[PDB]
Amino acid sequence: MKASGTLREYKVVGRCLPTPKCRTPPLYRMRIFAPNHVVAKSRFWYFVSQLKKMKKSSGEIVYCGQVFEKSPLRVKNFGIWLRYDSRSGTHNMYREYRDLTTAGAVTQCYRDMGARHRARAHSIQIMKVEEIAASKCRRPAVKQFHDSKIKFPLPHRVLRRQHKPRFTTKRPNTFF
Template sequence: MASAMLPVEHVFGAVAEGQCWLLGMSRFTEYSVVGRTLPTEADPAPKLYRMRIFAPNEVVAKSRYWYYLRQLKKAKKANGEIVALNIIHEKKPLKVKNFAIWLRYDSRSGTHNMVKEFRALSRAEAVESMYQDMAARHRARFRNVQILRVAEIEKTEDIRRPYIKQLITPGLKFPLPHRRTKSKAWYAANRPSTWA
């Protein structure tokens, strides 16, 4: 039976932007969402409000936008509109960077502020790691975590967390604990082929 390589679409389904974490892409995409309240006679040209939202797709990005705008300004989806929704791509997606994420989350006992540091290729990957970390350490769900700010740490002196500091030491080496020598094949399973 001839084994043929299947296209990725056959294995994982249609791969959309920022939706296939099995292929090494991030589950989250960074969106720039711009919206406003609907124009009225009292306010014919309402202010535009722009936010950077990390979400798995556009529908969730719009939903989170209205969630935050409803808290910050007197605006909601019923009397507002989305003007623009764009994906923000990473400028250098192959460079490993250190990120600091300021967040607020609701636990069983109250609301807490926190700063976490992550090492990732993009802001979206750092945010995904943050959500995984918050779920593991604090049992915080996606709906309970509010991202306040995501910033790249430019200088290595500004890194505060020891689990990130240990990865930036010069000449870092990792042990290879379970190396197995490959046994030499004394006998060939097939006859030698001299025909070229």
């Protein structure tokens, strides 16, 4: 699990091999977040082998599909439940974000945990991504965007293209 690129979401279902002892095994659905579907089906076995006694040698993937966003043009407040590991013991977390797709939020969560806690991607176990309303929010860094009349300027502007006219004559204005 290398959290490369924008993550996607996959609904992968599997089951044990059919045996004369048990006619048809039950089906197990998951929600995996992976860059490509190949490392999705691998990350699938990692979870099911610790919630069940099943391994890839005694299972079969039944459906490796990608699920798209129901409303990619709506802004949403996503609630993520984590299981990351530090250098000393593992912890449960509840991190909140604000994005357009759940995969857009999960990616954002992976960059943030790496940024705020120096945890690499192989240490984190996303367990629940729930769409919650603006009243059930808890983290203050996202509640501040709940305003029908939000209004804010752009402060002192970090001038880009600072190398295209590399040797100018005028002092570059930063107040737009």
